[PDB]
Structures are given as structure tokens and as C-alpha cells.
Design a protein around this nucleic acid. Sequence first.
DNA 1: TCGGATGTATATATCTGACACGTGCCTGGAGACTAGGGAGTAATCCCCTTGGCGGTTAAAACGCGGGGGACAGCGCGTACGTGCGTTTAAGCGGTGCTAGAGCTGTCTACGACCAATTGAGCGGCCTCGGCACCGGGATTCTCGA
DNA 2: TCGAGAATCCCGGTGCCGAGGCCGCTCAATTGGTCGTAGACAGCTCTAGCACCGCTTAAACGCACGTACGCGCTGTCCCCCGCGTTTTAACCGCCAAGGGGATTACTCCCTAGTCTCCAGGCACGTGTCAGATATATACATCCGA
Lengths: 228, 104, 105, 91, 93, 101, 97, 78, 78
Amino acid sequence: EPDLTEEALTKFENLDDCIYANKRIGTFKNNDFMECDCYEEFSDGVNHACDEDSDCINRLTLIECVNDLCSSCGNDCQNQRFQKKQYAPIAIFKTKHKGYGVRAEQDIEANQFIYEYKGEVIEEMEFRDRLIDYDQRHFKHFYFMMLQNGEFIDATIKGSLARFCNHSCSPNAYVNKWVVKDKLRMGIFAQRKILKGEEITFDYNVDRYGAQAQKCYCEEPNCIGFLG
Amino acid sequence: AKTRSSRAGLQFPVGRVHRLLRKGNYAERVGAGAPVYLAAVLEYLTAEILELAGNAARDNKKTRIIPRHLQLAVRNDEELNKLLGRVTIAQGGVLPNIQSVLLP
Amino acid sequence: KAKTRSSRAGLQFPVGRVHRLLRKGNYAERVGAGAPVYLAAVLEYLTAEILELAGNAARDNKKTRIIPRHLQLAVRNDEELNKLLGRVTIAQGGVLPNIQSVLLP
Amino acid sequence: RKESYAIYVYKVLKQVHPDTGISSKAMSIMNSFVNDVFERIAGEASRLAHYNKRSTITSREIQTAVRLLLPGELAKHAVSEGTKAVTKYTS
Amino acid sequence: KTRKESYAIYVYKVLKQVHPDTGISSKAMSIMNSFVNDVFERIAGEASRLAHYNKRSTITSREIQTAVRLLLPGELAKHAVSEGTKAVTKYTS
Amino acid sequence: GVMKPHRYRPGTVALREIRRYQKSTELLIRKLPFQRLVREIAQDFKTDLRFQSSAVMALQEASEAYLVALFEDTNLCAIHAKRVTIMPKDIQLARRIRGER
Amino acid sequence: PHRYRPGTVALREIRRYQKSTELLIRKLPFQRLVREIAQDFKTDLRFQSSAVMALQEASEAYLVALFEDTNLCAIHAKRVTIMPKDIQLARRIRGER
Amino acid sequence: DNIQGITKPAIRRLARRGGVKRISGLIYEETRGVLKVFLENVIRDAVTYTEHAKRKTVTAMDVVYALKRQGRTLYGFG
Amino acid sequence: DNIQGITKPAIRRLARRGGVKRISGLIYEETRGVLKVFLENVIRDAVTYTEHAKRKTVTAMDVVYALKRQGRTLYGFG
DNA sequence: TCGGATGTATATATCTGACACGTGCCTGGAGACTAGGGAGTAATCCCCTTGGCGGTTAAAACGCGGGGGACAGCGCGTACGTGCGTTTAAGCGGTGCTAGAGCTGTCTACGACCAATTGAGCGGCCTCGGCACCGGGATTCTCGA
DNA sequence: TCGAGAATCCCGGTGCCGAGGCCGCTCAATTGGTCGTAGACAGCTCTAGCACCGCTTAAACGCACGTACGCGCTGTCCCCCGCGTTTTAACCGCCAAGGGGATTACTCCCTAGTCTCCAGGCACGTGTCAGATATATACATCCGA
Ligand SMILES: C[S@@+](CC[C@H](N)C(=O)[O-])C[C@H]1O[C@@H](n2cnc3c(N)ncnc32)[C@H](O)[C@@H]1O
Ligand SMILES: [Zn+2]
Ligand SMILES: [Zn+2]
Ligand SMILES: [Zn+2]
């Protein structure tokens, strides 16, 4: 039932813009905006310039296209899938023993963007205290993400809809990284054609070091039993 | 005392070119129309180079011509690349290109 | 009597002709005295160095006269003469016999 | 004193693009370009004057050096501009 | 008609000194004459550039020696400089 | 623990560096080891020499363009050989076709 | 019914035309080609007998020096057969086109 | 149409002198094109020297000077 | 051993400027050898011009003249 | 609620920066005048270039069998990509000393220049020998048994 | 593991045309002397090159991990090579017209050299807006008590 989404919107605090604890945060270290080379601009109808099966160097190099900086390309692009928030239909449903796993609504093809992972950005010296008080307050799950070698992403209090998805050893999704106006943003694509009624999962590859070893309930013939 | 460059209607000097022709030991005798003709040729080539350099500078929203703009203005023309074929321009770089068999 | 500068310097190439070509070649205003002697010695050494290998090739191919084939062989078989004459086409000379190792069985 | 072409490139640049400037390294590159083209045309004209057993470099010799050194489209415009300058000088 | 100057008899004398019994045709003699003219023009042009770079007017034997050292590669340049120095030393005394 | 789902595929960061160093124009070799190399190879020609700064900069600006043109022709040889990886036989082929050896 | 394996006659011709030094392109078709592509620059010209020979020697040396590097490209491509992409590569590395 | 006068057994002999064991079928037109471009360049320079010399006969020395500008330096002809 | 001063992420950086996607391991010694041969060929002519000019310092004009003799005209230092 | 410490940043007033403008000047460019030698022009001669025609045959053109190499696909496994912590030396300032580059004077010796001379080298005409050509026999490589 | 069959070299006879030697003839190399200035040498200045040292921090190195492509192997099919027959225009020999390249003599006018006059570009001080920087106080923005 889709009422669990409306309940989860009352559980945590949903956000639409990326926030930071400090203004100077670890970003892409060479900022001069490498632009594309395509000169097509179908401004009368629909811009078919920056799409798949083409020669978009910003798409092949995993670089976001900026509207007011990329000359000789146009004003709107189909590569712009983060600033326009061209998302997918989402429905948070129940599972057997995992919890509230996100199950897909319609047929999502291969290599297609679903939803952007958002949340707070924390520093490691603050992440130590976050680990300590989230361990002593006895929360049921963990909602963290690695961004760089010394900067993490928190999504417990302030998160998004992508914080619910479970782990499976036979996944159907993968995570890339993108440079969107000197910002390192996440994103979840699709491996194969996800059919109707399938839970979208991806590999965590978690490296835990605490005093608890969780278990998995995927039960597929490629699993191990532990989490990393 | 009218200068010879003002009589010819050019911007490059003519008596300096005549002195360099008399100094460099190219022949025994130098004519009178040769420095005017050579100054006109040098002025046309300099005007072409500076025109393409100004176009390459306006293509990046800049107000000053740099050796990168000179490199692009030389290498983006067909005849100027044939003239300056084996000439290296300092602080110029190369043309940005990526081969088609390298793209995934 | 009246001697010559070629007999005075002990050379075979002429000195007055080289000095006249230096004075009439529009290279500089003033020409020294030892420069045509030095240049005639250098040209004579290069002529003897190429004719030694040409005569050796003519002896090795059981001939008497030197033809442009023997000149081509004498130039291309040496290293420094091939490095000097790297952008020179000698007429009626041909090429060197060379078959790559991946072509013959 | 030291002779160069630093003010004449300014005079050409203020006629081809008034609202721009140029640095010092680019001026050195332009001076090297003018000197190299001058030396190549002068050497080609000297060889063309020596091949015909003459002792005078004329506008015909410079025109032949330009037609031998520059490529097809550029040499025609160079000959046209030089002939116009010689005609204006002799008028 | 008109006298045509060539290096035929001098290359012939060098050939008869370096080989006692060896002939030569006319095409090979023309190739030798063109080779002598080419090396002459190369060394003279390099010496003219050397005299122009140092703001001089006189081409001495030092400019010819430096042109030989720049133009001939490796072992050949050393023997050419040695033979030319021996010839200048013999011409001086 | 912290999940680590991301790892770049080989080629993306490579093409990003290709675009970066085809856009930027700067010095690519360190100056002091190049200067020590030039002084060591110049010691073998004449003892007790002395260098300016612009001469060493001219040497470095020549060597940069020479090596970049060599790697461009070598990459063309490697593409003609139906490969992506450059082998030293491609360098030898480029130097032999160009006329250097 | 006596035939050779293909390659033996080819190596025999390689040895024969690397031993012999003579003209290979015929004189009258080359002369007609030179005159035809010389009509496009100046009308009513006149040629000597040695200028055509100099052009033919230069063209023969240029073509042999091109096919040597082309064969080296074909060997580097792990083939024996020469394709025109080897010609394009040999002319593009050298600095012609 | 004298470019077809460069026959198929002639380019084969040039390749046998060059050292070629096997020749494909698309080599001959490319060889004719390369020969045409090279001859147009050299004949253009020779006719330029001839028109500068105020004559009508293209001598061998004009061809030698045209090859010397390209960097060929043919020995044997003047 | 100042030839080891041409480090491994510098030849790789030159190749990334040249447009190279993937590099083997036997490229670096060959690149050091090519750079050493080229620099010896230029430094020999520069020291020859310096010895002819009766000086003891190697100026930039000697390097420009050596690169002019090598066939590589350099703009920006005249 | 009360007391205390803090990022942002424009109001006011200042510190580089590499290029863009008022003057001093002195050294190189411009205006007449003369002489002479390189260059333009007409006539002539011949010799090399172009054109046509006939005979012979080496070489170009055209089919045809086949077999060997170019090309497409699959699998192995290693070696070259990305990342992280550690180490190391490249930039970047400040000071000091000096070999050697750059600029002036003196004048000695070295090369430009002209007249007379004559031995040296370019051109015409034999001439005999070395390489071009052809016939016969011995030697060496090829390929299906 | 080898005999027919096709190239290929050795040797001998014929022959023919071109490298070499000889001789006559202009002409530029040689010798002598005079004279103008190019640079060899000594001296003075002063300026970048070399050496050293402290601080900072960005680049290189070693190692772990992995996965994507270079290369070996197999099939297949197609197209280029060897060989035989047919055609065809290239090579040679020969003759004939003629057109422009080289030469010679005559005439002219273009430019090098000289002197005098003068003004234009090279240094040498001032002035920019872009890019920042030393007090400081409203506007919130948290951290104890
Ligand atoms: C979808 S969210 C939380 C799930 C659910 N909404 C809840 O409240 O527990 C992801 C969390 O589920 C847990 N998880 C992932 N895979 C699991 C599995 N296979 N079985 C049980 N829990 C799993 C992880 O620990 C992770 O922190
Ligand atoms: Zn694009
Ligand atoms: Zn775009
Ligand atoms: Zn599991």
C-alpha cells in the first residue's frame, strides 16, 4: 500500500536541496567546466541533443550539463536529469523480514535513472559522535554512504526516498557519481529491465567494524551470509 | 617630409625593410618596389593572423589575445597550418580531439 | 716562377676557383685567406672518402668503371654517408636488396 | 636601443579589432613570425635572382617568391594586395 | 660556344690517386659534380649564417671549421677538421 | 558500517584526464630534475658550463611538443594495430616511418 | 600440369627487380600524363627530353619509398596483404595528408 | 584520360622493387591519386620557375629546383 | 641518475595530453631513451654555437638556432 | 531569559599588476645631385622540339582453377586501471658573492682594388679496349611421389 | 624421405661506341704595390647565475584489488596468384618544318654614394580598473547558566 510513503514523510524530514555542515566541502578539484561538442538544438520541439546512443562526451565522461554555461548546445537538455529531478514512480511496500523495501511500480528499462540518493553531509570527526550516539540510542538500521575518502553522507534524520532499499547478492541496480556544478551527487541506475513488482536492490559492499554482524534474507544461490 | 609608408598607403614600415634588404647580403642591388611589395605582404599576413586570433579570443569571452588563442587560430585554418607546418609555438598546447575507437 | 695555391697547400682541388665562388656567391662582404684552402681540403677528403667505397664496390662486383649503381651501393652501405645524404635521390641507382624475414618461408 | 615590430602590430590590431588587447608573449610570437616570413621570402627571392644571372631583387622577384612560398588561396590575395600597394605608390 | 666550368678533371685526379686502375663514366662524373656543388653550397650557407649571427663581415677559417663541425656527423667531421687543419698549417708555413 | 557501492570503471577517469590535459596548457615535467638532466648531459660536451633560464625553458618547450607529437603518432599506430594499449613497437614504427631511425 | 606454389614467383620478382635498375613506368604514357596535367597551368608549353626523365626518376623513387613504409605497416598489422589504409597511415605519419 | 596509362603490371613492378609479396585490388587507384598529387605539385613549381624565367621551354634545372624546394635533391641532371 | 627524474606520472601525463587511454609498462624506458637522444642532439649544437661565439654561457638564441637546424622552428624566444 | 562568542560583508580606506599614456632625445629616415653600369631592345642563326608514317614484337588485357590468408567468434588469465596511507622533494621567500656578459678606446695588420703576365684549363678529333649481346653446357632450386 | 622440370650461372666468340689522350687557344689566376678600416687586445662596469637555508604542502611510491582486453586457437570463404591465349600499342628508324634560346651590339635610366636636415620611436616616468585587503557592526546563530 502507498500509505507507507505518506507515513514515512511524517517519520523523517524530506528535503529537495542538498545541505552541508560547512560551505567548503570536498568537491571536484579541477573546476573549469569541460563542455560538450554537440551543436544540435531542437528548441522548437523536444531537445534530442544529449541522449543515449549518441556522442555526448559529458554523458560518456559522467559530467552534468549546465544550462547557463554550456554554449552551442541549447537551454534544456535530456542529460539534465538531476536539476530537473526527472525521477521514476516509487512505492514503498512491505517485505517479509527485511522491513519496508522499495518495490518498483512500472517497467524500468536498462540504464535508466530511478531516484537520487539525498541526505545530510557529515565530517568524520562528527561522524565518530554520530556513530557513538546512534549506537547507544539503539537504532534498528544504518543509513550512511561514502562520498570521498574523508567525507560521508548521512540520511537518518534528513534523508530521501532512496534510504529504504535493501541489500541483495543478485542486484538489479548500480550507483554512479556525477559532478553537478561542483557538487558530488549520487544516483541509482538500472542493470537490467526491471519488471513490475520487483524490489529494487543494489550491492552495499559495506565494511563494518562495530560489535554487531547483521544477517541477510535474500536467499539467492549467490549469497554468503554476512554483510561485507 | 612625407614618409614612404604614408605614400604607399600601408602600416608596416618601408625604409626599415629596405635597410634590412641592404644589410642581410641577399643581392648587390635592391629595387624600389620590392620593400613596398614585401611590406604589403607582411601586413596582409599579420592582419589575417590577428583577425583569426581576435575571433578565437571572442569565442571564449576574453579581452586579450593569448598564445593559446594564437595556437587555435593557426591550427584551425587550412592554409596557415600548411604554412606553419613544422613550427612550434610556445605555451600553445594542442587541439582537443578524442578518437572514436576510444569512446565506450 | 709563378706557383699555385693548390700546389702550395698540397691539395688537388683548386683554391682560386673556390675563392672566386666565395667572392661571387653573395655570402659576406669580406673573405679570408685560409677559408678556401680549408674548404678545398674538406671537399677533397669527402671526394676521396666516397670514391674509395665506389672503387671497392666496383672491384667487388668484378667491374672496372664506376656507375651510379656502384655509387648507390657505396653511399647506402655506409652509415655516416647515408646519414649525410638522407634526403638525396641518386638517378639510375635503384635500391638495396632487402627482403623482410616474415615474407620468405 | 633594440629594433622590433611591437608598435606596428598594435597599429594593425587596433584596425582589425578595436576593443581588444594583446600580451607580451603573444607579441614576441608575432615578432618571431614576421621575422621568419621576412627571412624566408628574402632567401627565396635571393635564390630566384641568383638563378637568372642577375644582381637585382625586384618586385617581380618578390612576387615569384610569394607565389612559390605561400599556398594557393593566400598567395593570390597577397599578390593582389602587394600589386595594389605598388600601384598606389607609383601613382 | 661558351665555356662550361666543372669539377670533372679534379675528381678524375683524386680517383687516379686513390685507385691506380679504375675508370668512371660520364653520369657518375655528373653525380660527383652535383655532390661537390651541393656540399659546397651547404657549408658556404652555414658559414654565412655563422658570420651573420656574430655580427661579423669576414668569413675566416673558424666559421668554415664550425660549419663542418655542425654539418658533418660523427667521425667524418673529426677527420675533415684534421685534414683541413693540416692543409691550413701547410699553407701557412 | 559505511556502505561502499561506488567504484569507477577503467576508462572514465582516463578520458577525463585526456580532456583535462588537452584543455590545459602548462608545464608537465618538473623543472629541477629536467635542469639537472640537461646539466648532466651537457657536462659531457664541455666542462664548466653555465646556463640561463630562458634557454632551459626553450629546451623544455621543445621537448614537450616533441614528446606529445610522438605519442600522438604512436597512438595512431596502436589504433591501426586494432588495439588500445600502446606497445614500444608502435614507438619504433613511428620513429622509423618519420625518419628518425 | 606443373605449377608453382603462390609466393615463389613473387619472391623471384622481388629479387629480380631489386637486382635490376631500369625504368618501370613506360615513357610515352608518363609523358602524356605530364603534358595533360601541365595543360592546366599554362597553355602551349614545351618540354625537353631530360625533364621528363627527371620527373620519372623522382616519381619512381617516391613510389618505391612509399611502398616500403606501406609494406612495413602491413607487417606491423600482422598481415601480408597491403590495403590502402596502410598507404593512408604511411602518408599521415610522414606528414603529407 | 592518361592517368589510366599507369597500368596494373607497372604498379606491381614498383611494389616488387619495394619488396611486396601480395597486393590487394584497391591499391592501384590510390597509387594513381598519390602520383597525380605529387606530379601536380612538382609541375606547378616547374611551370612557376618557367614563367618567371620568361621562357616557354621547361628545362631540367627547373625540375631540379622544384624537387630541391620539396626536399628531394636529385643528382644526375645538371 | 637524473634520467630517473622523468617520473612515471609525467610520461603518463604527456600521454594523457597526447590522447592515450591505456599504457603498457615498457613505454617509460623507451620514452626516456628518445628524450635523451633528442636532448643530446640539441645540446651538442647549442654547445657548438657557444664555443664558436667565444662565450661560456648558453643563451636562448643558441637553443633557437639549434632547433632551427633540427627543423623545428620555435616561436616565443627570439 | 541572561551573559558570551562568531560567520557573513559591505561602508571606508588601501596594496599589487601588466598594460595603457605625456615628454627627451638622438639616431636613423627623408630630399637633391651626379655618374656609371646593369638592364631593355632589335636582329640573326641554328639546333633542338614537334609532327607524320611503316614494321615488329614485348607487353598489356582477359578468362579460369584453386588454395591460402583475412576475418569472425570463443576462451584464458594476467597486467594495468583506481584508491589509500606514507614518504619525499618541488616550489617559494631571503641573502650573499662573483665570474663573466656588455660597452669603450688604439691602432696594427689584413683584405679590397688595379695593371701586366702567362701558365692553366675548356673544346675539337682520333682510337683502341671493356662491356653489350648471343649460343652452348653445367649447376641449383621446386614440387608432387 | 627424392627425379622431371624450370631458372640460373660459366665460358667463349663477336663488335662497337665512348673514356681517354693529344693539341691549339683564350683568360682568369698570380704577383706586385697602395690604402682603408675590422677587429684584437686591454680596461672598466654591473648583473644575473650559483650557492645556501628554512618552511610548507602537493606530488610520487608501494601495495591491495579486480576485471577487461591481448593473444592463442578454430572455422570459412573468397579473392588474388600462376598460367594460357588474344590483342595492341610501344620502341625504333626515318624524314621534314619551324620556333624560340643564345648571342651581339646599341642605348638608356635606376640606383649607390654623398651631404644636409629633421622628426619618430625607444626609454622613462604616471595612470588605470581587476583583484584583492585592514577595522567594524547589523543580522542572526548558537553555547552555558
Ligand atoms: C531499506 S533500509 C531499512 C529497512 C526497513 N525500512 C527498516 O526500517 O528496517 C536499509 C537497511 O536494511 C537492512 N538490510 C539490508 N538488507 C537486508 C536483508 N537482506 N535482511 C534484513 N535487513 C537488511 C540494512 O541494515 C540497512 O540498514
Ligand atoms: Zn553534449
Ligand atoms: Zn548538453
Ligand atoms: Zn545476503
